[PDB]
DNA sequence: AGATTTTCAGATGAAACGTAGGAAATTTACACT
DNA sequence: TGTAAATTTCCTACGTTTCATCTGAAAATCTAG
């Protein structure tokens, strides 16, 4: 009942429970970078909501404070870039780095990718620089993404790189070069029930108001999440629902939690579609009234026409679909029928009925 | 327990390669011209897996690189690890100091840029292509002819091809064989005795005091000697053996540990394989499990049963008759074509792997 | 017995299938000079 | 002139299903003295 903690933890929390070792080992490797000119690269692996992102922001964020105070750090530049948020593309990523490191005048298109690395050297020419790459599992999955990192990690301009991926098997996606010249991987083990109950008890302490939360209920949520799951972002945001709701009196009982849960699983789908590139939505409706992909594409080319907008190639369409399946919105079938003319791509809309409601709602609110 | 297991990873490269004395001779002799800057003869190496092929070559080239010190380039490229005609030609065009964009070019125009890199390169160069099997398997033979025609259609580079089966020499219809079998070495599988030498010379760098009984090594060797004289088996079997006697926190190794290793190794070989199996192939296998010394018929039968209990349309018996054989190659099932007068012509089918490892992983996917 | 004729139960071959998907070509948006 | 990424244009080879042809020794039938 004092929201400041629940959307900007990095401002409240001056420490990260159960990640102390991670945090220390880093500030060590960095002090050895500044005082020893010794490069280092690490790969933060872990499931979602295990503090990967949070930790990093904190290292970065505290070091911003450190060079202010210290002075021997005065001369160190930092860049924090989110390979997913930008494009996922090498070009997109390299541009951003060269943005902060150099100064910030930088092209996004037209330039030869090498002249980004050339640009970065010039902006840190002796002067030490640190790199953070959240969700580098995007960059890697794209052509030449590891072939970029390799030329980063193992180039001249003394630069230390931190890579936080969300996909764990992200090594099998990485070329020998890269993996070989890579530093140690640091794995964020998901939290257990006890760990969660403490974390929550911290958030409860700061954001909420004494009395409204007992001890069993904190125990309750941690029990829920923790058990094959891990994930702290849910755990925290889960409290928030049962919090919202329990503004009644209020005491917060097992109810408030249960609802908060359905409230969360189904509410997800809503914005999960709200924020869905324009044609994707049109494509998505195509599917709800025909699972046949070639057939859907026709009622797609229809809605485009009706909204004076160029319909995309069926190839690009089948992709947007394939891609919608990577999203967990639809499910592709592929039925093969030998002499009976087989090979048809199909797509199932998970709920069909829920999604439609959300699609309608979204189109409608975006007119008033 | 150890003091460097790294001396046991299929990376490390030793001072000497015992018993590959003739193979080394024959190569560095048939590569000699490089010293006066003169294109050598193309070599074609075949032998089973773990017979030294990759080892010898990577080592002979590191020796000539120093003996000659002479201008001389070699690029070792693993067709397996590359898995794409683009990537192969993209490194080949990187090793010659040439820059290619990640996208924008296309095979055809890629060979074009490559013929330029050669006629502009003043250093005789040897190209190593390991496990060509892989990259001729699920790609085209083409790369060969087009690489043959390449030094040929402008006057030079030299090649070394390393594959695994005799059957591969058959795929070389064009001058591809005529111009590669110029020199053709064979890497016979190792002897158990040979395999003991190889293990001992690498063990004394790896372990600790008398942490490792002689007796362990002789059987570690004779185990792998029984499964196609494989040198990489003999090494894993040993390393793991050590790692196992490590988690069992004691500072020695026991024969009991090696048999232990062997199984453990299967588990993971198969678990990996089984995980990357077509939903439908996982399916045929599953039935064979619930049946446990049966006939293709009974298999398709219990196959339809699970498609039914699962709501997932079946597949032709025709696809299942081969999906079986396919699991034979992977070494999960064993199926033989028996001939029994009035009991017909079936595949006697049975499990090669353990039953548990086959299901725990099986479930790991669904 | 020995010499046949079936008879079983599946192997092995081959064709027909029509788009899903991979690779080239074009377009988009820029940049530098 | 250029480059990197997004989309369009081309074209077949992919995983099967269907149709058609083989297989090979067991057993059940016949053979004739
Ligand atoms: N140990 C922790 N202490 C405090 N808050 C945490 C902790 N772990 C997770 N959180 C909260 O949950 C969110 C999820 O963690 P996050 O930084 O997203 O890691 P990831 O990038 O792996 O998802 C964080 O942004 C933070 O608000
Ligand atoms: N004669 C040998 N001496 C030492 N090690 C060997 C010998 N033959 C093979 N090996 C080892 O086997 C491992 C992989 O074998 P490798 O030669 O790559 O087999 P292949 O290349 O035939 O698949 C390497 O670690 C290498 O040390
Ligand atoms: K077309
Ligand atoms: Mg994250
Ligand atoms: Mg090899």
Q: Using CB atoms, which residue from A144, A176, A338 is nearest to B102? A: A144
Domain A1-15+191-277 falls in which CATH fold? Helicase, Ruva Protein; domain 3 (1.10.8)
Place of tokens 């087989």: A342
Name the CA radius of gyration of chain A, rounded: 24
Q: Is the CB of B318 under 7 A from strand C?
A: yes
| Angstrom distance (rounded) from CA A342 to CA A224 | 45
Resolution stated for this PDB structure, in Å: 3.3
Distance CA A342 to C1' D13 in A: 14
Query: SS3 of B32, please?
Result: helix
CA dihedral of B105, B110, B112, B115, whole degrees rounded to 10: 140
Beta bridge partners of B257: none
Question: How many residues can be counted in chain B?
Answer: 366
Are the Cβ atoms of B102 and A113 closer than 8 angstroms? yes
For residue A134, which phi and psi values (nearest 5 degrees)?
A: -65, 125
Beta bridge partners of B78: B130
| Angstrom distance (rounded) from CA A168 to CA B317 | 38
The domain B277-366 is classified under which CATH number: 3.40.50.2300, 1.10.10.10, 3.40.250.10, 3.40.50.170? 1.10.10.10
Q: Does A342 reach chain B within 8 Å, measured CB to CB?
A: no
| Angstrom distance (rounded) from CA B111 to CA B100 | 12
Please list the residue range(s) of chain B that carry CATH number 1.10.8.60. Answer: 1-16+190-276
- Does residue A100 have its Cβ closer than 6 Å to ligand 1? no
CB neighbour class for A220 (10 Å; exposed up to 12, middle 13-18, buried from 19): buried
Separate counts of helices (H) and strands (E) for chain B: 16, 8
| Angstrom distance (rounded) from CA B130 to CA B76 | 8
Q: Is the CB of B113 under 7 A from strand D?
A: no
CB neighbour class for B310 (10 Å; exposed up to 12, middle 13-18, buried from 19): exposed
Nearest CA to the C1' of C14 belongs to which residue? A339
Q: Spell out the alpha helix ranges (H) of B75-230.
A: 79-82, 85-92, 107-119, 132-137, 143-152, 175-178, 192-206, 214-226
Place of tokens 């954001």: A207
Q: Which helix (H) or strand (E) holds A162?
A: strand A159-164
For residue A20, give the ligand nearest its CA. 1
| Angstrom distance (rounded) from CA A52 to CA A26 | 13
Are the Cβ atoms of A176 and B102 closer than 8 angstroms? no
Query: SS3 of A78, please?
Result: strand
Q: Spell out the alpha helix ranges (H) of chain A.
A: 9-12, 20-34, 52-69, 83-86, 90-102, 114-123, 137-141, 146-153, 176-180, 193-206, 216-226, 232-245, 254-274, 278-288, 293-306, 314-326, 353-365
- Using a 7 Å cut-off to protein CB atoms, list the covered nucleotides of chain D: 2-10, 14-19, 23-27
Q: Which helix (H) or strand (E) holds B128?
A: strand B125-130
For residue A231, give the ligand nearest its CA. 1
Q: Is the CB of B361 under 7 A from strand C?
A: no
Q: Spell out the alpha helix ranges (H) of B84-158.
A: 85-92, 107-119, 132-137, 143-152
Q: Is the CB of A109 under 7 A from strand C?
A: yes
Alpha carbon B317 to its chain centroid, in Å, reads 32
- Does residue A50 have its Cβ closer than 6 Å to ligand 1? yes
First to last CA, chain B: 39
Q: Convert B46-68 to b/e letters by CB count within 10 Å (16 or more is b).
A: bbbbbbbbbbbbebbbeebeeee
Are B208 and B1 in contact by the 8 Å Cβ rule? The answer is: yes
Which of A 215-254 lie inside 8 A of B, CB atoms?
Answer: none
Q: Does A117 reach chain B within 8 Å, measured CB to CB?
A: no
Beta bridge partners of B248: none
Question: How many residues can be counted in chain A?
Answer: 368
- Does residue A190 have its Cβ closer than 6 Å to ligand 1? no
Domain A16-190 falls in which CATH fold? Rossmann fold (3.40.50)
- Write down the experimental method used for this entry: X-ray
| Angstrom distance (rounded) from CA A9 to CA A2 | 13
| Angstrom distance (rounded) from CA B179 to CA A338 | 41
Please list every residue in chain A whose beta carbon sits closer than 8 Å to the beta carbon of residue B99: 114
| Angstrom distance (rounded) from CA A198 to CA A19 | 13
For residue B36, which phi and psi values (nearest 5 degrees)?
A: -105, 20
| Angstrom distance (rounded) from CA B243 to CA B261 | 9
Query: SS3 of B149, please?
Result: helix
Q: Is the CB of B146 under 7 A from strand C?
A: no
Place of tokens 């894993």: B236
Q: Which helix (H) or strand (E) holds B73?
A: strand B73-78
Which residue ranges make up each domain of chain A? 1-15+191-277, 16-190, 278-368
Are B22 and B58 in contact by the 8 Å Cβ rule? The answer is: no
- Tally Cβ neighbours within 10 Å of residue B139: 15
State chain A's maximal CA–CA distance in angstroms.
76
| Angstrom distance (rounded) from CA A196 to CA B212 | 45
- Parallel, antiparallel, or unpaired: how do β-strands A129-134 and A159-164 relate? parallel
Alpha carbon A180 to its chain centroid, in Å, reads 26
Per-residue CA distances from A98 to A81, A85, A114, A125, A173 (Å): 11, 16, 11, 13, 25
Please list the residue range(s) of chain B that carry CATH number 1.10.10.10. Answer: 277-366
State chain B's maximal CA–CA distance in angstroms.
72
Question: Residue B111, annotated ligand binder?
Answer: no
Beta bridge partners of A333: A346
Report CA torsion sign: B357, B360, B361, B366. Answer: positive
A to B CB pairs, distance under 8 Å: 12
Please list every residue in chain A whose beta carbon sits closer than 8 Å to the beta carbon of residue B102: 90, 113, 143-144, 147
CB neighbour class for A310 (10 Å; exposed up to 12, middle 13-18, buried from 19): exposed
Place of tokens 């011209």: B33
Domain B1-16+190-276 falls in which CATH fold? Helicase, Ruva Protein; domain 3 (1.10.8)
Q: Does B316 reach chain A within 8 Å, measured CB to CB?
A: yes
Distance CA A81 to C1' C22 in A: 32
For residue B235, give the ligand nearest its CA. 2
- Does residue B241 have its Cβ closer than 6 Å to ligand 2? no
Task: From B357, B355, B356, B350, select the one nearest B333 (Cα to Cα).
Answer: B350
Are A335 and A344 in contact by the 8 Å Cβ rule? The answer is: yes
For residue B150, which phi and psi values (nearest 5 degrees)?
A: -80, -50
Q: Convert A197-211 to b/e letters by CB count within 10 Å (16 or more is b).
A: bebbebbbeebbeee
CATH code: domain B17-189 is 3.40.50.300
Ligand 5: centre distance to CA B54 (Å): 5
| Angstrom distance (rounded) from CA B7 to CA A320 | 49
Are the Cβ atoms of B99 and A143 closer than 8 angstroms? no
For an interface test with A, which of B102, B104, B105, B364 has the most A Cβ atoms less than 10 Å from its Cβ? Answer: B102
For A21, the token pair is: 């070792």
Q: Using CB atoms, which residue from A147, A176, A338 is nearest to B102? A: A147
Are B304 and B297 in contact by the 8 Å Cβ rule? The answer is: no
Q: Which helix (H) or strand (E) holds A186?
A: strand A185-188
Report CA torsion sign: B241, B246, B251, B257. Answer: negative
Please list the residue range(s) of chain B that carry CATH number 3.40.50.300. Answer: 17-189
| Angstrom distance (rounded) from CA A139 to CA A97 | 14
Query: SS3 of B160, please?
Result: strand
Alpha carbon A288 to its chain centroid, in Å, reads 28
Upstream peptide bond of A182 is cis (omega within 30 degrees of 0):
no
* Fold match between domain A16-190 and domain A278-368: no
For A106, the token pair is: 């930088």
Interhelix angle for B53-67 vs B21-29, to 10°?
Answer: 50
Domain A278-368 falls in which CATH fold? Arc Repressor Mutant, subunit A (1.10.10)
Name the CA radius of gyration of chain B, rounded: 24
């Amino acid at each position: 009942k004092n929201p400041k903690v629940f959307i900007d933890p990095l401002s409240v929390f001056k420490e990260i429970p159960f990640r102390e070792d991670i945090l220390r080992d880093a500030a060590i490797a960095i002090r050895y970078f500044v005082k020893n000119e010794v490069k280092f690269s690490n790969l933060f692996l872990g499931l979602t909501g295990t503090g990967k992102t949070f930790v990093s922001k904190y290292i970065f964020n505290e070091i911003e404070e450190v060079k202010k105070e210290d002075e021997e750090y005065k001369d160190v530049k930092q860049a924090y870039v989110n390979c997913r948020e930008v494009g996922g593309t090498p070009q997109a990523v390299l541009s951003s780095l060269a943005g902060k490191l150099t100064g910030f005048s930088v092209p996004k298109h037209g330039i030869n990718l090498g002249e980004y690395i050339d640009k970065i050297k010039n902006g840190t020419r002796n002067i030490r620089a640190i790199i953070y790459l959240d969700e580098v599992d995007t960059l890697v999955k794209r052509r030449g993404g590891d072939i970029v990192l390799y030329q980063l990690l193992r180039s001249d301009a003394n630069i230390s790189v931190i890579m936080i991926s969300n996909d764990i098997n992200v090594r099998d996606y990485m070329e020998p070069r890269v993996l070989s010249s890579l530093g140690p991987s640091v794995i964020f083990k998901p939290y257990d029930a006890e760990q969660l109950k403490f974390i929550l008890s911290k958030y409860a302490e700061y954001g909420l108001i004494k009395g409204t939360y007992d001890d069993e209920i904190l125990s309750y949520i941690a029990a829920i999440s923790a058990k094959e799951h891990g994930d702290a972002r849910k755990a925290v945001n889960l409290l928030f629902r049962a919090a919202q709701l329990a503004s009644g009196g209020g005491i917060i009982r097992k109810e408030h939690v249960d609802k908060a849960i359905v409230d969360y699983e189904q509410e997800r789908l809503i914005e999960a579609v709200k924020a869905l590139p324009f044609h994707y939505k049109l494509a998505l409706r195509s599917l709800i009234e025909s699972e046949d992909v070639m057939s859907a594409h026709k009622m797609y080319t229809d809605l485009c026409n009706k909204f004076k907008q160029k319909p995309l190639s069926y190839r690009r369409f089948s992709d947007i679909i394939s891609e919608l399946d990577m999203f967990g919105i639809v499910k592709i079938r592929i039925i093969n029928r030998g002499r009976a003319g087989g090979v048809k791509k199909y797509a199932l809309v998970e709920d069909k009925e829920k999604v439609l409601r959300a699609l309608n709602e979204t189109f409608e609110d975006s007119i008033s | 327990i150890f003091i460097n297991r790294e001396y046991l990873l299929p990376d490390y490269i030793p001072d000497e390669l015992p018993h590959r004395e003739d193979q080394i001779r024959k190569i560095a002799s048939i590569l000699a011209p490089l010293y006066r800057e003169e294109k050598p003869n193309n070599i074609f190496i075949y032998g089973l897996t773990g017979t030294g092929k990759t080892a010898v070559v990577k080592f002979v080239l590191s020796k000539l690189h120093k003996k000659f010190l002479g201008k001389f380039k070699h690029v070792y490229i693993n067709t397996r690890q590359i898995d794409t005609p683009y990537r192969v030609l993209a490194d080949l065009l990187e090793s010659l100091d040439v820059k290619v964009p990640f996208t924008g070019l296309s095979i055809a125009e890629l060979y074009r840029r490559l013929v330029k890199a050669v006629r502009d390169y003043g250093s005789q160069v040897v190209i190593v292509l390991d496990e060509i099997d892989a990259f001729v398997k699920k790609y085209n033979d083409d790369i060969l002819y087009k690489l043959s025609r390449i030094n040929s259609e402008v006057n030079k580079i030299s090649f070394i091809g390393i594959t695994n089966d005799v059957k591969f020499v058959d795929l070389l219809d064009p001058r591809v064989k005529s111009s590669l079998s110029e020199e053709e070495i064979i890497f016979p599988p190792y002897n158990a005795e040979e395999l003991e030498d190889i293990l001992t010379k690498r063990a004394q760098m790896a372990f600790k005091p008398g942490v490792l009984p002689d007796n362990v090594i002789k059987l570690c060797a004779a185990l792998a000697a029984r499964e196609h004289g494989d040198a990489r088996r003999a090494l894993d079997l040993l390393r793991v053996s050590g790692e196992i006697a490590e988690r069992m926190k004691d500072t020695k190794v026991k024969e009991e540990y090696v048999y232990m290793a062997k199984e453990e190794i299967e588990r993971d070989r198969v678990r990996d394989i089984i995980l990357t199996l077509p939903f439908h192939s996982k399916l045929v296998l599953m039935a064979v499990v619930s049946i446990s010394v049966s006939t293709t018929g009974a298999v398709y039968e219990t196959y339809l049963n699970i498609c039914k209990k699962l709501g997932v349309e079946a597949v032709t018996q025709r696809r299942v008759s081969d999906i079986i054989n396919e699991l034979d190659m992977v070494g999960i099932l064993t199926a033989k074509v028996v001939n029994r007068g009035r009991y017909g012509k079936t595949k006697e089918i049975g499990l090669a792997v353990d039953k548990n490892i086959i299901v725990r992983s099986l479930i790991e996917s669904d």
